[PDB]
Amino acid sequence: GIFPVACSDGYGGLVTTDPKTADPVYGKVFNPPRNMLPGRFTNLLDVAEACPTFLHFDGDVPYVTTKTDSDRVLAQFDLSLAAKHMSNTFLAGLAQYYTQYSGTVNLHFMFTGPTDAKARYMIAYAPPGMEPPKTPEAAAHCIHAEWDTGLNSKFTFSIPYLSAADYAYTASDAAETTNVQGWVCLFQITHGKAEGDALVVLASAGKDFELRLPVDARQQ
Amino acid sequence: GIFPVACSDGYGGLVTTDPKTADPVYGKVFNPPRNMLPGRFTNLLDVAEACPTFLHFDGDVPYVTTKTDSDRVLAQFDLSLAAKHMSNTFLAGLAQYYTQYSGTVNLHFMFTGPTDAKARYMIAYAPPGMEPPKTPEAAAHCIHAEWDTGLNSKFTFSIPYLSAADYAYTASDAAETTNVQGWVCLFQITHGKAEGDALVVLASAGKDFELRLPVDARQQ
Amino acid sequence: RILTTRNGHTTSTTQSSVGITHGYATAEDFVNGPNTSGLETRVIQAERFFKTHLFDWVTSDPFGRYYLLELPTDHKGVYGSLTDSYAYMRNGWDVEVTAVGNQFNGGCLLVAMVPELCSIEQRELFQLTLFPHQFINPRTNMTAHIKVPFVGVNRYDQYKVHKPWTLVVMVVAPLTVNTEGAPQIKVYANIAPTNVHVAGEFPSK
Amino acid sequence: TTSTGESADPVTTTVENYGGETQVQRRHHTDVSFILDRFVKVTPKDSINVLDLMQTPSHTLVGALLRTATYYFADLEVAVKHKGDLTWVPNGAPVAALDNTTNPTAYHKAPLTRLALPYTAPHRVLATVYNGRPLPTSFNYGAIKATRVIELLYRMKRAETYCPRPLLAVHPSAARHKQKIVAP
Amino acid sequence: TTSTGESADPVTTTVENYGGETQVQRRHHTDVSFILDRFVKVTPKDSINVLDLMQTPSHTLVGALLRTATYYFADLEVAVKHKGDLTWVPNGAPVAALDNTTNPTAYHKAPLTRLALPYTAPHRVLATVYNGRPLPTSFNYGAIKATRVIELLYRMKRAETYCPRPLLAVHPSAARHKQKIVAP
Amino acid sequence: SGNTGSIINNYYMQQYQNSMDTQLGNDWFSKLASSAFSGLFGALL
Amino acid sequence: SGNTGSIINNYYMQQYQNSMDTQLGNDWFSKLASSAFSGLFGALL
């Protein structure tokens, strides 16, 4: 007698993400050599860390100009990988195909004024629960850090990851208007003959950014 | 030729309790850590032994008051995990999803009178075949045991398991009105200035309770 | 018999305690998780006792009056300021419920620290002895002193939204002022947060 | 066996107090990861419905030994009679996602379609009750959609629970809750 | 962490600057040969259509993590619902070739027909963009024909890419791009 | 170990079968049942 | 290694399964991420 098997029920359907592989039809193909082609990248987060990209501030420009009036806030935005200020950047373009994330997000601030213009800035991180700060004197109780312009232009501050739940979403449902993650505020303390200058910003992945649960959902 | 098998007949149906496991579709998921979360329980009888729960005597209260009249019986009830006196307790709530049981069932009696009130009680176990006893003098030929109130309040007596068949049912069919398991009677011998006091009772699983043949049958 | 407990610079003495009822664990789990990025600190100034009023035991009350409170409650002292000055924080609890009556008042009282709940039906009361509990019996003892660790879904909790624990009392047997007992009992509580951690800072006004 | 009752210390006296001798008591059928692995059936919705382990009824065998544990963690399994091209999004995907074929999609193959999908959620362990009755949005396993879902089943794998909760038996009007039992 | 910004040198300061302590960050779900292996669906043509990896839409998960790499090499897989006797020519065969049965021809067998065909092309590595928009004729994998092709899917195997390219997220009108999320 | 009753290792790998666990750095109610006092509390005769 | 999750070697040979590679004579962007300067650039106090 032949080896008897029992054809199980509810198995074998073509699941779009099955680990199986199909059976070949042609075989015996030797393709041209590709030894050491320049510029190969293996992981999609490796390129996110090594290459930062600009944000999208008011208007279309990626820079903020220095405020000479009584105001002190340059621009504050939500800490979400779907926020408007991060509309068109690699880190927020890649993180729409994944559901959850957990890690740090570096911010690179680069001052592009003349040689005879000086300024001083502050960036602070306000967690959820309280409305964001509106004055630098009321924001000095956060995880802020200040820098001064000079010979070295760029300063990079990496906002931390604080959350009750272990991982956080890369989306914002309409039911949640509270912005569960928080804010990140950027203030300008003072400036000297710095009228109409520019402070271009960038954004890069952190040293321990983690991105998971892939879902390709209606972008292209 | 390929390995020839014979697809057997009458096999492979989706039995609701098959030991097989389905085939995956997503894979590669690392969940958050759960090292040493407080209060994990592995078996459902472990919680039944370590935590007793109250009975349901006449009315809604779980206690019996002291009888000052000529009567001596406080309350006697069937020895069945479906009885009314055990309507709402963990041990009888868990034992409705299983068909049969075999073991001991402890009873914890706790006296809550004043400091100047004294009493003495008896609990006896009457097997099937004879109608239950009605007087303490006629019940002293059972497996009874008496205790006295004092410094230590609680006394725990574990009624034994006696049965011809090796296991016993956790139900009571209408065809069997004989109460095949028996009774458990609780009498009050005497009392001194113990008017209107209270003797709250409890019930816990035994040291060798065994519960088997699971059937989820029409409770929720 | 005699037992003196101390939390911080505050103490308490009871001469009739029947022990401490450790619940759900003896020690706490790991308190430096991967979510907080190590930006967490342990304040020690906020492990002192504080007091509140629950209700008054009386002869009219039959079996099944619970009168439960959910905590962390509002706090005048230090620990009340932390939830106002920090986002996430975690802490165990160390309760002590006292009901001073007399040697001659019959009755019973059950107190248990149960996890998250809003309301309990009358049928579930018969099975309240699954959570960390202790009986207050005026013939013998007058203090409960349960001791539970922090437990929750996620590691650090936002006490402005989720209140995990809830101290629950219950009259198992009615009070009886037979001959010489006190006419009524007034139940108090002596809770004290223990092992408080805190992470994430707020901007003031 | 008199001992102080107001102490919550377990006291399990045995049959050896009056001559008895305890037989051996083996408990395999009452484990917590063996009793939950049994395909409880839930009331299925129309085209789109979510995989939440709490829409199962509260009077079954899996639905009632689950609302006896405050916290629980368990992988999942389903077996649905989809009349179409059932798809499945992970936890947290925008509900418009379950229209694309890149998401894990099983094709029709009579009669059932049995899947074994992992546990994906931010929290380290879910919960039955929650002291905010509505639970949060984060407490689920995912959402499936088909043209017309006909049947649906749940089978928890590797289940492990914490912090028990009360179980309730049916209250009979008579002294004893009598009923029928199978008999030849 | 002030450093010369006009240097294109990566500078990734961490949380340990102000007391922090970086947890461990494991990235398996974001690899380049693990995320592309997922049967993206392409708009199928009539009787005859060519196997070009660029007719897949530019907004899917495979079609959009592919137009982010200038060059790529990957074996292929298909699964088509042919209503007939589907055949497949190699790369460069005269388009009248897909009428003969000697070429690899699969017979009808309900419901699908899953094939795993190699990568055949003169160039050592294909390209998404090309500075000659129309690409050359040489950039393809082959051409299949049947009486009426109904469905078609692409699943790259052993994918490996070079020279990254920009990825774009959807631009929201509001300050934040809100939308629905599955919830019980 | 639940309703798993085959003597052959499953065809698919472990990480694809179910979510791999992660560590940091019945358990308790079974410790409670063993702590149960059972001896006599008084002087037997 | 992609969505390949069987613990049994595929029935067909290697050369028939997929195109065999040829040699002559992530690689680079992962070398870039490790080159990333992260220390402090000034004198800490």
Author numbering:
A (entry chain 3), B (entry chain 3): 1 to 220
C (entry chain 2): 13 to 217
D (entry chain 1), E (entry chain 1): 1 to 132, 157 to 208
F (entry chain 4), G (entry chain 4): 15 to 39, 65 to 84
Q: What wording appears in the published article?
A:
FMD virus (FMDV) is a member of the Aphthovirus genus within the Picornaviridae family. It is approximately 30 nm in diameter, forms an icosahedral structure with a sedimentation coefficient of 146S, and consists of 60 copies of each of the capsid proteins VP1 to VP4 (9). FMDV is more highly sensitive to acids and heat than other picornaviruses, which is conducive to virus infection and replication.
Therefore, thermostable FMD particles are needed for use in vaccines. Sequence analysis of the P1 region revealed the following three unique mutants with stable nonsynonymous capsid mutations compared with the wild-type virus: M3 (V2056I, A1013T, K1133E, and T1174I), M9 (Y2079H, K1045Q, A1079V, and D1085E), and M10 (A1013T). The capsids of the mutants M3 and M10 were able to resist higher temperatures than that of the wild-type virus. To elucidate the molecular mechanism underlying the stabilization of mutant M3, the structure of the SDG-purified 146S particles of the wild-type and mutant M3 viruses were determined by single-particle cryo-EM. Icosahedral reconstruction of particles was achieved at resolutions of 3.1 Å and 3.6 Å, respectively. Mutation T1174I is located near the capsid’s 5-fold axis and, thus, is unlikely to improve capsid stability from a structural point of view. On the other hand, the bigger hydrophobic side chain of I2056 at the pentamer interface pushes the hydrophilic side chain of Q2057 to form a hydrogen bond with Y2098 of the adjacent VP2, reinforcing the charge interaction between the αB helix and βE-hairpin of VP2 to stabilize the 2-fold axis of the capsid (rectangle 2).
